[PDB]
Amino acid sequence: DLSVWGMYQHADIVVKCVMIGLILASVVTWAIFFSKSVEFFNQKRRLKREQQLLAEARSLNQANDIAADFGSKSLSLHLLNEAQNELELSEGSDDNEGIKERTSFRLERRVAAVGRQMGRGNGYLATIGAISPFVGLFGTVWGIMNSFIGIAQTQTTNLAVVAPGIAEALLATAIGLVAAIPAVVIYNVFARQIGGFKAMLGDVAAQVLLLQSRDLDLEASAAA
Amino acid sequence: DLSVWGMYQHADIVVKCVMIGLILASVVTWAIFFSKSVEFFNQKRRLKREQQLLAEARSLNQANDIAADFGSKSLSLHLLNEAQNELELSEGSDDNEGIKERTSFRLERRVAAVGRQMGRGNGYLATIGAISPFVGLFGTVWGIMNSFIGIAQTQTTNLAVVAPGIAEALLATAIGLVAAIPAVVIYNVFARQIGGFKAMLGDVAAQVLLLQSRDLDLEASAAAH
Amino acid sequence: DLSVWGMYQHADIVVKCVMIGLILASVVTWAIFFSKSVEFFNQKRRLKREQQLLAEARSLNQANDIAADFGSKSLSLHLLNEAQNELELSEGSDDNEGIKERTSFRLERRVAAVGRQMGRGNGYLATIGAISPFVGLFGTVWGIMNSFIGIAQTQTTNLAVVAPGIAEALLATAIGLVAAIPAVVIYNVFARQIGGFKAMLGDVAAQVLLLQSRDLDLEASAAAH
Amino acid sequence: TDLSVWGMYQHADIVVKCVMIGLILASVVTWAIFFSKSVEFFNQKRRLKREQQLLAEARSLNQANDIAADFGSKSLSLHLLNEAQNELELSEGSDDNEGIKERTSFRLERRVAAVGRQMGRGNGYLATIGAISPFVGLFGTVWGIMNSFIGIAQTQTTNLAVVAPGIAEALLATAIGLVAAIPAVVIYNVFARQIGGFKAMLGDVAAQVLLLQSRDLDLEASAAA
Amino acid sequence: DLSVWGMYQHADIVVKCVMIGLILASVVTWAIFFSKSVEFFNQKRRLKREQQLLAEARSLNQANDIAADFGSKSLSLHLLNEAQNELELSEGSDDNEGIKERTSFRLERRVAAVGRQMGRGNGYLATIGAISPFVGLFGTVWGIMNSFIGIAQTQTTNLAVVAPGIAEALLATAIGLVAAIPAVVIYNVFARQIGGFKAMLGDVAAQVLLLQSRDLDLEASAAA
Amino acid sequence: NGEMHDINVTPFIDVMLVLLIIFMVAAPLA
Amino acid sequence: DNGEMHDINVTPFIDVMLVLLIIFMVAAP
Amino acid sequence: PWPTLLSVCIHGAVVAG
Description:
Chain F: Involved in the TonB-dependent energy-dependent transport of various receptor-bound substrates. Chain F: The chain crosses the membrane at residues 12-30. Chain F: This is Biopolymer transport protein ExbD. The complex is a heterooctamer, with 5 copies of chain A, 2 copies of chain F and 1 copy of chain H. Chain A has one domain. In chain A, helix 5 (97-118) runs antiparallel to helix 7 (163-222) and helix 6 (122-154) packs antiparallel against helix 7 (163-222). Chain A contains 7 helices and no strands. Chain A is an all-alpha fold. Chain F is mostly helical. By secondary structure, chain H is an all-alpha fold. Chains in contact: A-B, A-D, A-F, A-G, A-H, B-C, B-F, C-E, C-F, C-G, D-E, D-G, E-G, F-G. The A-B interface holds A 89-90, 92-95, 98, 101-102, 105-106, 109, 112-113, 116, 123, 126-127, 130-131, 134-135, 137-138, 141-142, 144-146, 148-149, 151-153, 155-157, 159 and B 1, 3, 7, 58, 133, 158-160, 163-164, 166-167, 170-171, 173-174, 177-178, 180-181, 184-185, 188-189, 192, 195-196, 199, 202-203, 206, 209-210, 213-214, 217-218, 220-222, 224.
């Protein structure tokens, strides 16, 4: 009778719902992991190559002519368009440092916005990591409490009557930790991996700014 | 004998008081949730709709003209008419960089102020999510002490005569975790909603600064020609 | 008898010293709470009254004429006269960019120094909120250990010979939680109250920078025209 | 019949076998990272400290290049000097100097960040293993303990004679968890200390390059005036 | 007997080793506390006097004349010399904003370097505070394991012969926490004492920047 | 975001202490 | 911040307490 | 969506019990 599967089937409905809720939370934290691991791998793999192509660039118009080969989903092409658009909107200006300040502000906000867009699912991982121990312990305490109500009702001294109830209660802690540990680890992996990706994207945005900054100073110098 | 209320009522005055305390914490941690979630939504929807209209604007003058139909409680209108106010109070100056630094500073201060005003309730949620299992554990430990004093006075030896006392005790911790779990998920929902919202408001504030900054530089060029 | 005070009387010297240590940490937590809560209600109620009077100002001279009625210990007057002093030390200089820079730096330094001084007590509360549950835990370990001494000395299984160790472990847990709960609650409410106050004082200091920056522009424009 | 600290692994449950091999894998990777890091990190810091002390003599950026010219292509100090020199030889047509100073500051800031970000390579493992290994040990022990309560329930019998092997397995999972966690925390804290020291030393070389560049440009501009 | 000394004397060599390792950890965390507390007291007492005297200054030359008799270890005299040394490296420069920026960058580097340099032994306190609980727990788990291996190979089952063996195991948790709590308290105290001191030193460095920046632009404006 | 994302273990240690003390009272009486 | 880890972590004491819980359950009745 | 199908597949197997 008392396999681990039989131990679930004989337990109280409250702790059975706790076990099912922790199994579903486990399915979610693994579905988020397989979803995002592939996505961050593809974006990291692409962006690292776009940076190698742009490393050859000497002026912003040449960086545009390189980046026109990049797909319309590419983040480096997006940044370069965020820079080029601040030029075309400013076409009447004789002040150049206003173009530099406005472009730096736009690109810094774009890098932050992309970095935030990476994080969409992480609220589930953070929550499931934080609450799964507590949901497990509620299942354990409820099972233990229910067993002592059993002893009060059946008025029987023998602790061997409590041993099944203790196993059923400890299983809720075990399943609680099996839901918690992957979620806490994977949240820390993605938090570090997003920080690494934001920094790589910032290094591309910095090259766009450096290219524009030389290009404007050379053009303003060559005018006199 | 019973398994829930039979033990709750037989329980002593401090276990009673602790269990009432956690039930009061549960109701406030759900009132905050219903009270905030309808507002945060009306804020998120209204600000998102305003940003989608303002994103078309090409000058701060045009942005004022399209924002003027927004309600008096509009966050974006309350930024646009402040960038206009900073330019109006400064009208005797010819220092465009001086107007830009003052407006940038004033807009940042207001974006932070709306951020503080959206996050008002989170102090309760963050506290209740941290303390409530320990408050339950105190109720349980004092319940065990009262059961232990109870045996040490009568020196009993029947496992069943202790069983109802130890049960009640655990209920306190069970109620402690039931108060804790909602407060942690509800806190994380609002922590993530605040992060997204302050950033979305920050992008509207940034558009006001970009429109003003570009408009001043073009106006100075057109004057000097 | 076998009462809770009899349970304290019977406990080992190490567990008495854990209980007495945590009771002293508890009473000084409440002493510093009653002291700082009054001092945070006084300063915040006063500062709210300043900002509301000072928000009328349209020149730095009018801001001084409003602030002159404020008491010697008023934080806002103590920010106005920093901006005034940086101008009066600098009358020989026409680099208004330098006056604005030096003033902004002094005011940023002073707002940080007031926040830094206001936080004095928080280091104690933050220590007790983290440490006191583990000081409790050490007393529970000592109680559980003394239980095993009791059976090892008597080779007998009964409740009455383990009883002193259960008694000690319960008291060490209860007093450990009674120290921890108010310390982590009070640390949160003061961290919230300081975060609000330091930002509100920043919003008063910002108004001083706006008024000074505006005055120097209007003066420079009038001198050029 | 009898058992040993190997025989109990040979007599352990699948889950507990799998957990113990999992923490043994965590143990061998943390020691592999310690040797992989420390042999390189000692040599990198020992190099950079010699470069910093040798460049500290310099009075101009040309004098720093004449010192650095034989530090070896892998020297971070030569890499920063040459990559600051690279901004001048790209800006040759610029009569504006503050743009060169600004761009060089921005380039060197990102190179200092990138080299620090590259040296932190192993820390994801060390922080994860140090924080999470005791929870994996706790899961392993809870499974062994739960199985021992099933052994009680199955046999309707109660003696240390049947349970002692079961708790010996359950403890061995915890002991292996502690043997994995302790080195990982020690190794993480020594590399956090050493990284912080190296980051500041590298930032000081980067600051020396900016100071040398800016002072030389400002003096060349004055000599040309 | 079964006193604390009797338990230490009778314990297994590994648990006996863990007790000695934790007592050495207790000794070094108190030796660090008494070594550093007198240096933080002397640094605060001296620096507060320097800041109280320098508050009278109205030019950088007057601040040097006030500072002239400060001991050669003094952090305020070090900061005045860092600023003075920039002016006499920069003698030919007409770019006063260049001098201000170079000085501001140097004094920020110096202030950060002092605060980093004086927080030297906080790695031992952090490490001892983090691992002390564990090593002690490892001593208990090893002592408990040896007890049962004993009972499992010798049958004859009774809690009375295990009881002293698990008491002298539980003692290594007690010593493990006695090593932990001082170290985690002291590390938290020193993190705040460094934070307060680094800020006070920052306010002296700020006065040097204010004195330099003001008297530099007054002298430049008076030359008109 | 100040999202709570980490296991604070002390509630558990203390609920396991409750579980220990409960049976450490009841079992020698049984 | 320095990014080192200095927190009091006592997690494996739960493992000791499960074993003590077993000792009382098995030996004491 | 393969992620959720692959997740419920790897769990489904371990939850055979």
